[PDB]
Amino acid sequence: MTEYKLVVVGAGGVGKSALTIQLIQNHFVDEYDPTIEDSYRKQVVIDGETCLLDILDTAGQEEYSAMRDQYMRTGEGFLCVFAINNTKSFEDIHQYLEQIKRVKDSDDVPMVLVGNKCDLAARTVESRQAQDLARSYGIPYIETSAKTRQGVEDAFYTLVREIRQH
Ligand SMILES: Nc1nc2c(ncn2[C@@H]2O[C@H](COP(=O)(O)OP(=O)(O)NP(=O)(O)O)[C@@H](O)[C@H]2O)c(=O)[nH]1
Ligand SMILES: [Mg+2]
């Protein structure tokens, strides 16, 4: 069956793992557990077709700039995550978008910009700011909360649809 090679990228602590674990395992990882590199494979049905999600959950670590080019080369779609209560994570996601485009030699890579932790009150990134960034890359912006599950399936399934209809 069709496989979708999804890669979840972004700064440390934005919720890359919590989002993936919510999607695959249906619960919220409410603990400190930094990632090295984890892979999740799951058969799902999206819009009436069986497919395999192969999800690579990456490290936010800025020192892993070597494994980073490699997964960017092989990935098909990227969920580019920042946290809406962490302005520095929003500025960091710019560098991920640019690196993907450099490594893939393409301005047309399936991507979704994800503003995570939308359940938290202390928002410092306004939605319009993130919409403008997404629009400059021609990609959707979707807000999520790995805690409440708001937007989680929307974000991942939108990324699949961006690939599928590419
Ligand atoms: N309130 C709230 N907390 C969240 C959300 N997503 C993640 N968190 C919390 O934020 C922290 C970091 O989450 P985690 O998924 O490990 O982040 P990560 O991006 O995978 N970090 P790393 O790059 O080190 O692997 C954890 O305490 C987690 O419970 C969310 O949507 N809402
Ligand atoms: Mg992680």
UniProtKB/Swiss-Prot annotation:
Gene (UniProt): HRAS
N-acetylmethionine: residues carrying this PTM: M1
Family classification: Belongs to the small GTPase superfamily. Ras family.
Disorder named in the UniProt entry: Costello syndrome: A rare condition characterized by prenatally increased growth, postnatal growth deficiency, intellectual disability, distinctive facial appearance, cardiovascular abnormalities (typically pulmonic stenosis, hypertrophic cardiomyopathy and/or atrial tachycardia), tumor predisposition, skin and musculoskeletal abnormalities.
Protein's membrane topology: Lipid-anchor
GO molecular function: G protein activity; GDP binding; GTP binding; GTPase activity; phospholipase C activator activity; protein-membrane adaptor activity
Effect recorded for A83T: GTP-binding activity reduced by factor of 30
Record's protein name: GTPase HRas
Organism expressing this protein natively: Homo sapiens
InterPro entries linked to this entry: P-loop_NTPase, Small_GTP-bd, Small_GTPase, Small_GTPase_Ras-type
